[PDB]
Write a protein that binds this ligand. Structure first.
Ligand SMILES: [Cu+2]
Lengths: 21, 29
């Protein structure tokens, strides 16, 4: 998932918005 | 905006920034 993706690979701030409430 | 390399507490900082008062869920495997 994104915790993994952001650290092992790269992620965007837009991808992070998916985790907002 | 640009792509991010974010591990550990740095990821939760970015979540805080992006989501702010909306709040967010931090859910690792
Ligand atoms: Cu550090």
């Amino acid at each position: 998932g994104i915790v993994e993706q952001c650290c092992a690979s790269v992620c965007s701030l837009y991808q992070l918005e998916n985790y907002c409430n | 905006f640009v792509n991010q390399h974010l591990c550990g507490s740095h990821l939760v900082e970015a979540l805080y920034l992006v989501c702010g008062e909306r709040g967010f869920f931090y859910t690792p495997k």
